[PDB]
Write a protein that binds this ligand. Structure first.
Ligand SMILES: O=C(O)C1=C[C@H](O)[C@H](O)[C@H](O[C@H]2[C@H](O)[C@H](O)[C@H](O[C@H]3[C@H](O)[C@H](O)[C@H](O)O[C@H]3C(=O)O)O[C@H]2C(=O)O)O1
Length: 766
């Protein structure tokens, strides 16, 4: 009987769940632990209300292939205890000391979301092709329906634009390797787009052929499928060379193989399955064995490739490989148990909404396919119940620069897929605000389908068909009753929405101080804010996407100097490629407090600044939303030494600067900021043009943004207070302030022209 290794968790590993430190949000709980030393090992899990773990009251789960698990039945309410051990398969017995006992509590309030076991899952799975989206009877049923009404679920609209143009198009030549094997943005993007079109051709032609009973469309689909199965698996389009191209090729193969299964000949099936299996193997290895996301979960493309690649492929391949059976099980068990590391059940997505767009787009697909293949519904999990509200409060219709993180679209109106995603969650939740969002996004963004981040990723005519065939037709509800404030505690994101339905009065505000630091898609932007008020973008996310690994990306957008945030001694929060440091350079939402006409968020970004500057000791920002009109921002910095303080805000146009203020006027809206109190002395205020140090070529023929730079002279103690008053340009607003400093605390009294007052009571220590 061996000793069990119970390693101490790390910042970039999974944790031990559930515990007193992390109560379960689902019934039955999601169980994860860090693996034993013996990389080839199987586990046994004990659960009991009895702290002594007696037979009568212990549930036992044996032969657990993985170091994470979800039981197939919910638990009765009460106080629980659990522990795990090594399990010897042949001897059918535990063969190591049991783990530390951890405790958790079950209540009736917790969603009941069991995961059907492998036996169940395998037995409910169909064995005949097709399997993806529709099965054999569903196809026949649907085909009869199309014969009766050619516009069923919008079929002919799909046919007209997503099927027909493929008939007159030459089969996509196999993409070439990059000149010198040096990844170039242009060639990398084009290459994955090339492969995306191949998904479209194969998948749409095949579906059409079989829905319409048309041998000529299957032949067109086959011609594409075979040309592709013939591409070099170790060539350019490998996971290794360009995983974006790679992912896509697999998907196409999966669909062609699944829907042309009967149309292919003996060889053609074997030629295809052969090429499909090997390509899927590259991904499956990378995800399970290489990155090992059940240990190191913070891998963007790996996590994503679960739904985007593994799900369609493993379903295609079932019964034709025991590896695929294993891979599917991992994929389903992961999505049910550990998905997603970028989120908690609050619905927020740490990578930002834009990554939420892609991450969900694919999950939806996998969620759907899974539902359709084996009946299991991931949508019942709290996170998916709630996640629809994330783009609602962060990518609200009309907003261009009012959120955070890497954004391919930065500057455009919110992307179509955000709408389309939300509608899916509408369909699942019955929430009409979601259906409102879809409508308005879809409308504001028509004619946009052909942009690289849309065409290169999804076909909306297809996503539309899938939805309309599978889901109810939810009604829109005016977002007027939507609560102003939504806090996303699991990621450290606070948002405010006002009058979302009114383009003159619509306000979007988000403040972010995140325990994810500048890891993956996040930037060095803890204690940062963005402000879209009165129907315009005022305090913006600055710069352009340009390309991943551009200078604009790495030395501007990733950096604090591009945020609405402070600099300390001219230094910002760590935003380089080392992810341990990145995750260490974090902040958090200390507290949120709400009462009529006064919201207050407090963020601690102390760690974030410390990583690059050991002199920093305390970094607090308070943000006040006063009487649904204006903002008071409090910055409190303590160092071990005099350190200069720098306050930044970013705008599209040039800002005008006062002795202790600044003013920006956009096209229909403007705002001003006044530094009313600064314990470190009066700040010198500069307006900076452009993007210093950023290669002028990367934004050539684009509009240069501006930013203000309020600089307080060196001090070991900073207490800065900034009044922010946004306004409709038609109706400019002014707040008056008064300082009652003398005393234990420094008091500041604000009021408007109708003498409605606000009291800021600020202690002198923090
Ligand atoms: O560049 C695009 O055309 C693009 C379109 C999509 O809208 C999406 O925003 C896409 O984002 C991906 C990006 O191109 C890179 O692949 C990047 O990959 C990184 C990865 O996600 C992770 O952060 C880690 O640091 O590795 C990176 C890498 O060098 O590959 O992000 C992609 C993503 O996962 O969204 O950009």
């Amino acid at each position: 009987q061996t000793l069990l290794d119970e390693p101490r968790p790390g910042s970039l590993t999974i944790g031990y769940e559930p515990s007193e430190e992390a109560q379960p949000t689902e019934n039955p709980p999601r169980f994860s632990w860090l693996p034993d030393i013996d990389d080839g090992a199987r586990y046994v899990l004990r659960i009991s209300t009895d702290p002594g773990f007696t037979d009568k009251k212990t549930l036992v789960f044996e032969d657990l292939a993985w170091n994470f698990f979800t039981p197939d039945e919910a638990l009765p309410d009460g106080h629980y205890h659990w522990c795990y051990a090594l399990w010897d398969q042949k001897s059918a017995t535990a063969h190591s000391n049991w783990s530390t006992v951890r405790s958790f509590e079950i209540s009736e309030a917790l969603p009941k979301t069991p995961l059907p076991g492998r036996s169940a899952r395998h037995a409910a799975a169909q064995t005949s092709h097709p399997r993806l989206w529709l099965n054999s009877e569903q196809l026949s049923a649907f085909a009869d329906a199309v014969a009766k009404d050619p516009n069923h679920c919008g079929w002919a609209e799909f046919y007209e634009k997503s099927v027909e143009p493929w008939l007159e198009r030459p089969v996509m030549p196999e993409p070439q390797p990059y000149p010198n094997n040096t990844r170039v943005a242009t060639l990398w993007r084009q290459m994955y787009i090339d492969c995306q079109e191949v998904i479209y051709a194969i998948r749409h032609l095949a579906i059409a052929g079989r829905v319409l009973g048309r041998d000529d469309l299957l032949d067109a689909s086959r011609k594409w499928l075979l040309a592709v199965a013939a591409w070099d698996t170790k060539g350019a389009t490998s996971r290794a060379y360009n995983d974006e191209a790679g992912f896509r090729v697999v998907v196409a193969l999966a669909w062609g193989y699944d829907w042309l299964y009967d149309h292919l000949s003996e060889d053609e099936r074997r030629t295809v399955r052969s090429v499909l299996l090997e390509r899927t193997r590259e991904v499956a290895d990378h995800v399970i064995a290489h990155a090992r996301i059940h240990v190191f979960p913070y891998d963007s493309h790996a996590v994503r490739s679960l739904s985007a690649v593994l799900t369609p492929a493993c379903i295609a391949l079932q019964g034709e490989s025991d590896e695929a059976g294993e891979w599917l099980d991992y994929t389903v068990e992961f999505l049910a148990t550990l998905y997603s590391p970028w989120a908690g059940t609050d619905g927020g997505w740490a990578e930002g909404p834009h990554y939420w767009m892609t991450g969900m787009a694919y999950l939806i697909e996998a969620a759907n396919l899974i539902r359709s293949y084996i009946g299991y519904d991931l949508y019942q999990r709290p996170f998916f119940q709630n996640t629809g509200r994330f783009p609602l409060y962060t990518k609200a219709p009309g907003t261009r620069r009012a959120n955070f993180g890497d954004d391919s679209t930065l500057g455009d109106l919110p992307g179509l897929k955000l709408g389309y995603n939300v509608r899916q969650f509408a369909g699942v939740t019955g929430n009409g605000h979601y259906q409102w969002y879809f409508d308005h996004i879809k409308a504001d963004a028509t004619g946009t389908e052909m942009a690289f981040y849309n065409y290169g990723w999804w076909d909306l005519n297809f996503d539309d068909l899938v939805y309309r065939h599978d889901y109810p037709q939810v009604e829109a509800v005016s977002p007027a009753d939507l609560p102003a404030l939504a806090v996303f505690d699991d990621i450290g994101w606070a948002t405010i929405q006002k009058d979302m339905e009114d383009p003159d009065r619509h306000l979007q505000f988000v403040f972010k101080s995140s325990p994810y630091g500048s890891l993956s898609a996040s930037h060095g932007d803890q204690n940062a804010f963005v402000l879209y008020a009165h129907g315009e973008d005022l305090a913006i996310q600055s710069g352009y996407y340009v390309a991943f690994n551009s200078q604009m990306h790495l030395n501007w957008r990733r950096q604090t100097r591009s945020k609405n945030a402070v600099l300390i001694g001219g230094k910002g929060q760590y935003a380089e490629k080392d992810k341990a440091l990145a995750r260490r350079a974090a902040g958090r939402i200390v507290s949120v407090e709400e009462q009529p006409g006064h919201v207050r968020i407090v963020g601690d970004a102390t760690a974030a600044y410390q990583v690059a500057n050991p002199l920093v000791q305390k970094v607090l920002r308070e943000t006040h939303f006063v009487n649904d009109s204006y903002f008071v921002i409090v910055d409190e910095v303590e160092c071990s030494e005099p350190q200069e303080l720098q306050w930044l805000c970013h705008t599209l146009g040039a800002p005008q600067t006062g002795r202790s203020s600044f003013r920006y006027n956009g096209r229909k809206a403007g705002f001003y900021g006044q530094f009313v109190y600064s314990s470190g002395g009066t700040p010198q205020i500069s307006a900076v043009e452009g993007f210093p140090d950023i290669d002028p070529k990367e934004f050539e023929g684009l509009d240069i943004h501006h930013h203000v730079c309020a600089t307080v002279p060196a001090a070991t103690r900073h207490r800065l207070v900034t009044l922010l008053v946004p306004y409709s340009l038609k109706e400019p607003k002014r707040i008056f302030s008064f300082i009652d400093d003398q005393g234990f605390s420094t008091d500041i009294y604000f009021s408007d022209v109708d003498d409605e007052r606000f009291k800021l009571s600020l202690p002198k220590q923090f």
